[PDB]
Design a protein around this ligand. Structure first.
Ligand SMILES: Nc1ncnc2c1ncn2[C@@H]1O[C@H](C[C@@H](N)CC[C@H](N)C(=O)O)[C@@H](O)[C@H]1O
Length: 261
């Protein structure tokens, strides 16, 4: 017996390229990044433009109380820094440490002057899978690289969970962890065990593209994991089979301001 998500992935992989591109943003929420893309090219670091689409995804979860960043924030796989710079704007946050691998094929941290930027320290050249754990109040992780092979996505997601387990054991109050492939058996088995110990629940952020099944394990949710994943799989399959496409629903990107804290 297979999860519905396995059927979604199989159907996704059978789409033609043009079908895939018509499907991937159909009916999703998307922030208009035109001004932000221009800002990064012009070296505009004070205009409040997020360095990535990640900022809007985390803002969506924070504003709904799914995670409450505060104290010392650690951002595993910080990339350009979208999540890290966002957290630094938040009143209860006091320090942000971001780590990311960088190098060929991987995003480097971007130095910004969004509000609270002086609270942020981003370090490239760090493979978090071999970094000793550190104490934190808020633990964030947005790692996981897509593959057409569900077993590869499954293994990559399990490795993330096994790393997060070590960091959560230092004593973490709030967390938000990307689950790249929530429908495969090894991920479900691992996640149910970690939810039993650490709590939380899985949520789907509507800014995620239909072309991926990513969900976020967040301390501020509580649902049954199997049911949560199936709900997303049915929604994504329903969208795949409704062939009068409309593209995304457009909204405004986050404004991160400027200035030190
Ligand atoms: N083993 C690793 N160690 C550190 N960083 C990694 C590793 N594997 C992947 N990454 C990085 O993790 C990042 C994941 C991104 N989705 C993070 C985006 C970030 N949340 C933002 O808002 O911009 C990518 O930039 C990867 O290069």
């Amino acid at each position: 017996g297979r999860m519905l998500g396995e059927m979604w992935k199989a159907q996704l992989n059978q789409l033609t390229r043009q079908e895939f591109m018509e499907y991937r943003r159909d009916g999703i929420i998307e922030v208009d990044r035109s001004a932000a893309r221009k800002a990064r090219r012009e070296g505009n670091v004070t205009g409040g433009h997020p360095v990535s689409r990640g900022t809007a995804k985390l803002r969506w979860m924070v504003e709904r109380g799914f995670v409450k960043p505060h104290g010392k924030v650690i951002d595993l796989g910080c990339g350009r820094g979208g999540w890290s710079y966002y957290c630094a704007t938040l009143k209860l946050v006091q320090e942000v440490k971001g780590y990311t691998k960088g190098g060929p094929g991987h995003e480097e941290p971007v130095m910004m002057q969004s509000y609270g930027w002086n609270l942020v320290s981003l370090k490239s050249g760090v493979d978090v899978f071999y970094r000793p754990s550190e104490q934190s109040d808020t633990l964030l992780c947005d790692i996981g690289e897509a593959s057409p092979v569900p077993e590869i996505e499954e293994a990559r997601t399990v490795k993330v969970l096994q790393m997060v387990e070590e960091w959560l054991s230092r004593g973490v109050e709030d967390f938000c962890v990307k689950i790249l492939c929530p429908y495969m058996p090894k991920v479900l088995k691992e996640l149910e065990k970690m939810q039993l110990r650490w709590g939380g629940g899985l949520i789907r952020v509507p800014l995620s593209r239909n072309s991926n099944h990513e969900m976020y394990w967040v301390s501020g949710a509580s649902g049954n994991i199997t049911n949560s994943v199936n709900t997303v799989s049915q929604m994504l399959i329903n969208r795949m089979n409704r062939t009068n496409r409309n593209g995304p629903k457009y909204e405004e990107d986050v404004h991160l301001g400027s200035g030190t804290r």
